[PDB]
Amino acid sequence: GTILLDLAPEDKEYQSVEEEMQSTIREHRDGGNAGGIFNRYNVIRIQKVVNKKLRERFCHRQKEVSEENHNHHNERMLFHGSPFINAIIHKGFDERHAYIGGMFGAGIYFAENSSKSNQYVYGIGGGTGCPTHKDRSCYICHRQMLFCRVTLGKSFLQFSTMKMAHAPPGHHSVIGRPYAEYVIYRGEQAYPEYLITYQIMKPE
Ligand SMILES: [Zn+2]
């Protein structure tokens, strides 16, 4: 099944993941309501998700996609926040949890900004925050997010709300602009490469 492999802080791979996370923090339109108020994270663990079965499913789909995107699977590293991170790392992403709704339909959504994914760690709009304090801006409780390999193939650009069930004909993903939201409609188009444990930090 799934094995979690810790990365050591001295490892350039750990450093690369933390740098992508810290450097993509931005101020959000909701004034910090969903994800909290912070300028940086305290990254306290980075694990690689190792699952031969899940990896085989992802590579098999990459091969299907490359054939339709002129030998390119167009992979991007993107963040994903979710209260269901335990199911994802054990069973993989699953589009069946995505229903006709959402700004860009029944897909799984990813962000270039780690702070955007941090808004979804405790639910839509941050839910009711952490389980212990019910605080969307909790500095105590440890959070987790994923940094994923996402097979985008041929992306379709969308600039208004729609409720698509699948990507348009001949396409494999939707890049939606309400900052871009990257949407796939098959769970096997994302691999949960890194599981990051972190806190948001109080501003100084
Ligand atoms: Zn808390």
Numbering used by the authors: 1105 to 1282, 1289 to 1314
Authors' description from the paper:
Poly(ADP-ribosyl) polymerases (PARPs) are a subgroup of four enzymes (PARP1, PARP2, PARP5a, and PARP5b; PARP5a and PARP5b are also known as tankyrase1 [TNKS1] and tankyrase2 [TNKS2], respectively) that continue the reaction (PARylation) to generate long chains of linear and branched poly-ADP-ribose (PAR) on target proteins. PARP1 is involved in repairing single-stranded DNA breaks making its inhibition an attractive strategy in oncology especially in those cancers that have defects in additional repair pathways. Thus, TNKS activity promotes Wnt/β-catenin pathway, and TNKSs are potential drug targets for the treatment of cancers driven by Wnt/β-catenin pathway, most notably colorectal cancers. We determined crystal structures of the catalytic domain of PARP1 and the ART domain of TNKS1 in the absence and the presence of the ligands.
TNKS1–niraparib structure has two molecules in the asymmetric unit, and they show different D-loop conformations. In one of the protein molecules, the D-loop is significantly raised relative to the ligand-binding site, offering minimal ligand-binding contacts. Consequently, the piperidine ring of niraparib has no interpretable electron density, and it is not modeled. In the second molecule, the D-loop is lowered and offers some stabilizing interactions so that the entire ligand could be modeled. This variation among molecules in the asymmetric unit of the same crystal structure suggests lack of intimate stabilizing interactions between the protein and the ligand. Furthermore, we analyzed the torsion energy profile of the rotatable bonds of the ordered niraparib molecule. The torsion angle of the rotatable bond connecting the phenyl ring with the piperidine ring is at a significantly higher energy state than the corresponding torsion in PARP1–niraparib structure. When the lower energy PARP1-bound conformation of niraparib is modeled into the TNKS1 structure, steric conflicts with Ile1228 are observed. Thus, like olaparib, the small molecule conformational energetics contribute to the weaker binding potency of niraparib to TNKS1. In addition, the piperidine nitrogen coordinates a water molecule that makes network of interactions with the protein backbone as well as surrounding water molecules. On the other hand, there is poor charge complementarity between the TNKS1-binding site and the piperidine of the ligand (unlike PARP1 where acidic groups from the helical domain create favorable electrostatic environment).
